[PDB]
Amino acid sequence: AQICDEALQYAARLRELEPGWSATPGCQLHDAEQLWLDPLRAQTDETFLQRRLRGDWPAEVGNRFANWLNRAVSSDSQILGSPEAAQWSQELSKELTMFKEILEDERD
Amino acid sequence: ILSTASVLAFERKLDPSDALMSAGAWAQRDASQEWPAVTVREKSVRGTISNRLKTKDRDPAKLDASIQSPNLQTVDVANLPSDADTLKVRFTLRVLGGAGTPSACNDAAYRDKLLQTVATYVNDQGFAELARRYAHNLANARFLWRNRVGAEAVEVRINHIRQGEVARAWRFDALAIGLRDFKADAELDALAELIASGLSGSGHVLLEVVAFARIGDGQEVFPSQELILDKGDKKGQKSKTLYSVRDAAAIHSQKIGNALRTIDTWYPDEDGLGPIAVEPYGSVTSQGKAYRQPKQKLDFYTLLDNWVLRDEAPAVEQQHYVIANLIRGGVFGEA
Amino acid sequence: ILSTASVLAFERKLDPSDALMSAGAWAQRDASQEWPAVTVREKSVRGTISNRLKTKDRDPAKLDASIQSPNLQTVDVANLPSDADTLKVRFTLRVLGGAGTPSACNDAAYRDKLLQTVATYVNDQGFAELARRYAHNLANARFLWRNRVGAEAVEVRINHIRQGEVARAWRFDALAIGLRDFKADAELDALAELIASGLSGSGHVLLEVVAFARIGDGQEVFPSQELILDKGDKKGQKSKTLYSVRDAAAIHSQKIGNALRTIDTWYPDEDGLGPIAVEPYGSVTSQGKAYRQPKQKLDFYTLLDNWVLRDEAPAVEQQHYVIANLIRGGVFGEA
Amino acid sequence: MNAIHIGPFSITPAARGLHYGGLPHHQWTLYYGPREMAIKTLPDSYTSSEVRDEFSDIIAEFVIDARHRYAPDVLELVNSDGDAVLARVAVSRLPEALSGCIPDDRFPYWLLTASRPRLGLPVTLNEYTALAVELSAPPLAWITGLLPGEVLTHDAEEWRPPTSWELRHVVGEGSFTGVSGAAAAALLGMSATNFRKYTAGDSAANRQKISFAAWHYLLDRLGVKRAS
Amino acid sequence: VTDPEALLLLPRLSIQNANAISSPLTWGFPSPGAFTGFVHALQRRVGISLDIELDGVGIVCHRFEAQISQPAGKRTKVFNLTRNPLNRDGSTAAIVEEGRAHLEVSLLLGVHGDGLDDHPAQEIARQVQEQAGAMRLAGGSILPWCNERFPAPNAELLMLGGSDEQRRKNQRRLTRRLLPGFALVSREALLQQHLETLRTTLPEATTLDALLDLCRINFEPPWQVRDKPGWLVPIPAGYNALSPLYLPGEVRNARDRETPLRFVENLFGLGEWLSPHRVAALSDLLWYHHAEPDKGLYRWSTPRFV
């Protein structure tokens, strides 16, 4: 839970940055996460990207973060054989369900 | 004392080239030298939400808000030109030989015992059944995976190149040669004898295999699909890309090799489904189920260890399977 | 008491350049100066389980779960174009000389004794057997490591570049001159005296070596493979990375130098393998073992210490091995 | 002031003194023989204990790196499955019968190396007991990686007596064995002054070279080499 | 002691030079008693005129900077000082080591009373904000945000929600407002159960040692670190009686001769900094006074937390 808390905290200090840093030019700038990285670009663009975050409601990004969280687990076959991986997947699914629900109502 | 070597790296035999895809009309195949190559193109798709829901997306208003925002992708598609009902696919296959000699090994005693076991196998029953089955997998366009499934007619030409010129041409008919029946044919026996000479180290064998499949005018062909890093946006998400070399769609060489390896009809389960690929633990990824499980002791590793260390020679079809696994190569040993 | 010097670093003779790979066709090799280079491209590979399971992954459900999660990778691949069957490899070899003189030597008197030992070697027999064997490794394309195990025909052209121009040309057949026998040939002897004059110090020797291999149209050519940092995601893992210099596949220089070094036939094991590389303690990476063990008293250090410190000169084959290690060079002496 | 000798380590100051801040300072230098590892500016009001504690972190880091750099190899005795490690023994050298090995059901117990291409042999418990008796490493074996090869060899003609530096690796002050001069003299059966003649170098007077049998028995008793 | 009918969010407040020495044993973030006293001073100054009560404060602490320095050769820290004026003879006065800290905190205030029905929410919110913009929070002046880009008004949210989902959405929006910070809560139950765990580990262990063990990094031999549930700071938990409660005119040189004085000693407890999304409701974070004046024990805590 603490880790996803820090993710929100990271997004929290991403509220302290420029309003339109996500609209800068670049070949690769993680545009899948950019709807949640910069919430203030909806003030910058009236209809180019303001309606995109409202219509899309980006909550799958934490699943990508869950993939990064899948790099936080040990590569042990004993956990996968036993129900330890089942409990890990259950608590991971619950906490990223909470994270996706947090990321869903960012428009209010 | 003859323990199995910790490294038993094997170079793969039957090395295939990358199978280039072009398109044209049927009965122009004899003039198919300068056919225009199939080009991977972009097309935009929007889609409704059509996966199974997890009993919380099944609310009416929430599903209504889901369908009101269709998901957007740009998919790479490979289509024939509209004045073309036939797809041509070209690759080359190299038959090397020395199938029992590992490229990397640790124990020289185990290497010599494995070499003597493979030489014993060549001595009683040389590379004939495996070469006939590989000839059948060349005869039918199994390397046209989803790409001869709905084909009205499939034809396969296998040419033998000696000094830059053709030596023996093998024009086939892939509808007659089934994907399940390993029968006998005189041209198939000749191709089996050529792959026999290649696999036994008697000579060098390089085969140019061209498959013409009658799918349809402007229809969809199915090349190898690549991997997407997903570094773009969500509207043009690029959810699917197809493999090409130089503005010319193609199939991966390992896909062709897995097509030629589908000869294994000796797995302990029922063989009414058909042949599966040559592999340890008989694992087909479409079914998701492993025949030749290590519980049944019919996998490659248990049979190879029983054959070499304990000198328990298996059934003749099973040692055919073991030597076919050595032909396909691997990183056998400790991993 | 004339002990060994603590620092005995030696510079390498026979310095090879990086071996650039290009692509082309047979019988156009007389005008192969414009040939497009082999480009290290990328292709996606999907794999199932093919390694030995450690008795806990052998359960059917766990194995099938591992099958349903295939290991997707991207691999750097080097293939010829579909109209190109010939792989060209070009490298320059510079023969220096002064192999007796160390780059660093703590003990003067030891330096004088080692110089006198090399001088009495050359007065007994000059750089003639070693240069003949190095010229044999020049003539056969042993520097074409895996681009010769399935090649139909290999050809090697060696030019003596004196003042930026060809002073003497040699053309060979790399398949006739095998990787096992050190026979005698007139052009091979002339190249042997050229390498002899380079190694003694008579003149400056630079050789441009061009290799052509009949692999096959569109077949996979094998450059040297780099080292993987293993930092990215498991999807785009980049399991294999090949070596290129400027958008152009190449073999590492030390790989070429090791393949030219493969002349050591006088190791105490049998001649079943053939020549190995001249290493201290005669190491072979593929076999995973060391010929010329220090226990059997035929390693480079024991032979050199008997030859220099206590004047116990070995047999002329072991003298050739010691002088070949001095040509090879290394950080000899106690660290 | 003067140098601080911690085993093979020498903390020697520069003779020049600087005045960093307002207080006088000296540039203290830490050597492991000829190689310096840390040059640090320390006050002249520092005692010898504080100068020692300033470099103690780098000293402990070098000790940890030497332990993890010259650690002896590990042989694992496993069952027929080859996964459950039944026993582990740190060996000074591997058996000569080792070859590339994967365990089978043909033999109940197998011996393997801890390296990734594991080398091993089918062993019984008596033969594994004999191999472990013959080849086991002593506990402080890593100090043999910090000694030259010519002072550890068992042949007479290829053996050089160790210097005061290589003796101070294992004998006195902050040596890697952890013993003092009196304890290492008690293990060798010689007097304190007679062994202090061995440890102290400088001029040839009151300084002798240790013999072959005394040096080898000292390394046997200290648990550095040849101590099964 | 009561459930708030509304929650008033005082925004990012930049306190300039707050008392970094929170307690005789702890330094850093100031005492929660300072925040509760500030809210009671706000109720004393402008709360009565608005017919509302202001009890309970939730601290978020969006930014902390300590006016400290690390001297060379020491792993500890020292406090940067201010040059006091000279004495009447021109000499330097005796230095009292006082540390300062620049804070940026936002406060959740529990509002209950009939005046919430008598005024608009933004009116009472703006009145308490403009009252708080000329006050002090821990000994430091409050920077009232002049000539920046976008100033932040309050958002008084009524806790009497019509529906549970609307109340949940209001609490999540109010948590999203105070996002780059950490709610500081009281952990008497956690400290007591850790004291019981140490008493099972080793007897006659005081609560001070259990508080100390929950703050130091414990290194365990096989060398790993003994983990902690949260941040687990040592906070001043209130004041305990050190003298009988004397008469208002009894104590010489008191602040006023109408308020009774009693000499006290600092009470030390365990506090925890959490991300504010890890709470059921934002009214759990409110710091309440709790006097119990017959037995000393003048505490501040977070009741109704868990």
UniProtKB/TrEMBL annotation, chain E:
Superkingdom of the source species: Bacteria
InterPro entries named in the record: CRISPR-assoc_prot_Csy2
Pfam family, one: Cas_Csy2
Identification of the protein by name: Uncharacterized protein
